[PDB]
């Protein structure tokens, strides 16, 4: 009887949450921003093509100088790219060819990679010996490590496939904080510009906003109907961008605690692999399993552009911190710097 | 090539040397055979890897041919999210147990765990990534099945079975039941084998089946098939 009473209390509390969310809604985003000028047509050309990978490309990350790149591929290679001149600054052989994420440190001193061995390895780019060597391997996850992101300094947050996220301490090597509350595999992370709050999206069709200092979840957003593969912040750090396997993007919000926009098309049945914004937060670029990328117009619903230079699944996206380029990686082992 | 500074010339030379290293290491890795090894609980994967924390790669060599066996048994997660990693392996080594028609799952005492194994086989050979990868089905523990079938009829697992309960034909029936789950009989082939716990021809069989797979892939890409 107590278990059923507690379940009924949880159900009525969820109903109260739904009523509160419905009460704080006046008019959707499609109504207030109806009279703004359209973006029109956005055309991009492939300025550079970065060749050298010999397998499917699963991750990439831009440097904070908006010129250096890192990319991870299944052939056991982590390659640092010079976007301007196509030169290869570094080529790092991973101890594990099963890599599904990579991050580049904001200070540029470090890179990270993770995958199917449940361990996040960190490499020191600027050493006195001239080579790149492993500085620390972080172990402690039981499910596959699906995303990693460096914080401001000497700290990394990793989301894995065992429904738990972890904030580590690279100086020591143990989980400073553990975030729990997901009932499915966590596939994507995103960090606020102020780097105090972060967001994890999971296969439970849910996205949770955690607190790094406290270590406890603040808000939970639902509404999707399948697994979640991509997540991103708005440039002001007060909105979402969730990409799911049911061919829909959604724009949540942290203060209103309610979904705002749905970016969908009847001609699209494939899932979404990566999602990112532009510098101003007006263009939302989303990768697809339809072998191309779509440039949606936020604050509206109509499409704005198509980036169809690839002949396989687009697995990763990225917009420079400056905002002058959009790199794109796919399973045909080519990066393309659009502009 | 002419408006580059001296430092930029050296940077481009470094990039070219890195490209050469990548090409050499990538030619080294296209000469190794990768075999995704699957199974179910207590199938016999341990004895298979013996007689011949995430993924556990294994390396071995037989007659100047290097093999890599990517066991993923210990990783409990959604297969839908990392099974496309292995899209591109030469063959799949699927191990099942013949003596599993009388045992039952610990979680639920029904479906005799063999329909459960067949569920995984159906889910793996009808995938949308493995539409062109062969399979090497190992039917493990054939010696224990011989005594198990002499005491208990095989109809316990199969209500529709109709035949004498001897090993030489019950084994044929179970082989046929596993092979009938294939939905693309032209694109991919299943190389079934009856192995014991103390058998020494399993690695040789893997070698023959994988040379066959490679020859067929070559004939397919050359246009002759």
């Amino acid at each position, epitope marked *: 009887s107590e278990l059923d009473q507690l379940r009924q209390e949880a159900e009525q509390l969820k109903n109260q949450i739904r009523d509160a969310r419905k009460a704080c809604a006046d008019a959707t985003l499609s109504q207030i921003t109806n009279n703004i000028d359209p973006v029109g047509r956005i055309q991009m050309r492939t300025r550079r093509t970065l060749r050298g990978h010999l397998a499917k490309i699963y991750a990439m990350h831009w440097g904070t100088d908006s010129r*250096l790149l890192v990319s991870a591929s299944q052939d056991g290679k982590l390659i640092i790219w010079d976007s301007y001149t196509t030169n290869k600054v570094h080529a790092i052989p991973l101890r594990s060819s099963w890599v599904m994420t990579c991050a580049y440190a904001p200070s540029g001193n470090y890179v990270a990679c993770g995958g199917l061995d449940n361990i996040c390895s960190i490499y020191n780019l600027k050493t006195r010996e*001239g080579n790149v060597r492993v500085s620390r391997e972080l172990a402690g996850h039981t499910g596959y490590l699906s995303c990693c992101r460096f914080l401001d300094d000497n700290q990394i947050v990793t989301s894995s496939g065992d429904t738990t996220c972890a904030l580590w301490d690279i100086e020591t090597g143990q989980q400073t904080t553990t975030f729990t509350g997901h009932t499915g595999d966590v596939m994507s992370l995103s960090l606020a510009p102020d780097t105090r709050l972060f967001v994890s999206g999971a296969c439970d069709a849910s996205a949770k906003l955690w607190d790094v200092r406290e270590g406890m979840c603040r808000q939970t957003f639902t509404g999707h109907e399948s697994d979640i593969n991509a997540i991103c912040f708005f440039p002001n750090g007060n909105a979402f961008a969730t990409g799911s396997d049911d061919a829909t993007c959604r724009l949540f919000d942290l203060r209103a605690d309610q979904e705002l926009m749905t970016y969908s098309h009847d001609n699209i049945i494939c899932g979404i692999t990566s999602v990112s914004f532009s510098k101003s937060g007006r263009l939302l670029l989303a990768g697809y399993d339809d072998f191309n990328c779509n440039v949606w117009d936020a604050l509206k619903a109509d499409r704005a552009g198509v980036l169809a230079g690839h002949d396989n699944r687009v697995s990763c996206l990225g917009v420079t911190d400056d905002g002058m380029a959009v790199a794109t990686g796919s399973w045909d082992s080519f990066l393309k710097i659009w502009n | 090539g002419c*408006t580059l500074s*001296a430092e930029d010339k*050296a940077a481009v*030379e*470094r990039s070219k040397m890195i490209d050469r290293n990548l090409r050499e290491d990538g030619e080294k890795a296209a000469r190794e055979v990768k075999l995704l090894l699957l199974g179910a609980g207590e199938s016999g994967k341990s004895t298979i890897v013996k007689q011949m924390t995430g993924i556990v790669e294994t390396h071995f060599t037989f007659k100047d041919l290097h093999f890599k066996m990517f066991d993923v048994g210990g990783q409990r997660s959604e297969r839908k999210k990392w099974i496309h990693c292995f899209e591109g392996v030469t063959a799949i080594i699927f191990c099942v147990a013949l003596s599993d028609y009388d045992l039952v799952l610990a979680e639920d005492e029904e479906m005799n765990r063999m329909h459960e194994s067949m569920k995984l086989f159906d889910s793996i050979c009808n995938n949308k990534w493995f539409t062109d990868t062969s399979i090497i089905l190992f039917l493990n523990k054939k010696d224990l099945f011989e005594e198990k079938i002499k005491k208990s009829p095989l109809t316990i697992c199969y209500p529709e079975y109709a035949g004498s309960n001897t090993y030489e034909e019950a084994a044929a029936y179970i082989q046929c039941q596993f092979e009938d789950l294939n939905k693309r009989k032209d694109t991919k082939e299943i190389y079934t084998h009856f192995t014991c716990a103390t058998d020494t021809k399993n690695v040789q069989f893997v070698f023959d089946a994988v040379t066959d797979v490679i020859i067929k892939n070559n004939l397919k890409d050359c246009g002759l098939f």
Partner: single-chain antibody
Amino acid sequence: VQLVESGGGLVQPGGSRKLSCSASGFAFSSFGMHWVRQAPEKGLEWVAYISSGSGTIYYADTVKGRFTISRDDPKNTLFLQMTSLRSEDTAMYYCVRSIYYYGSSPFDFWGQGTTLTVSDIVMTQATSSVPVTPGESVSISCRSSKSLLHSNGNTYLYWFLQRPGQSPQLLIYRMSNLASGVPDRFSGSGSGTAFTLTISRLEAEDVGVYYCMQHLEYPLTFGAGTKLE
């Protein structure tokens, strides 16, 4: 990181001599290597250069065709074969490490020295010696034949510092950056053909001779050397 070099000594003119440098402490196979000699007249001037892939060799347009430079990666040893030694080829030789990619330090580490005795854009320093005062800052000037600012934005001017009885140490590369282990008191500026180096608090270890260098194009040319005492 240590480069130990040998092969010097008294040699009669017209002979031959091999200078050998052994590298121990870094991946020598990925570093381009130079040779810089300094006569007792306190003048640094570049000699040769071999790249990382054992190609793209350069020589100064004074001794070309007489010296050969080679590297051995399995042994990690750099050889310089010297033939027809003239009377003007007596100097102390240093082996210099170098690495080139986006944002590296191409003259970070120098050798130890080898005394050998026998029996084009120009870089000009302002003065030869400057009086010092620890209370006030110290400014050193340098001028070049033409502008060192390339079209890609880099201004290939370097700054060194040779203490008495020691080897030169990199302080500033590309006239706006700072090396590893160098205190942040040093700063560099300039525009076009004229550059300057500023030191805030001169100390006991800040005395010595300061040298300019350009890496815009070969041959690399040093300055006269301002002597802070």
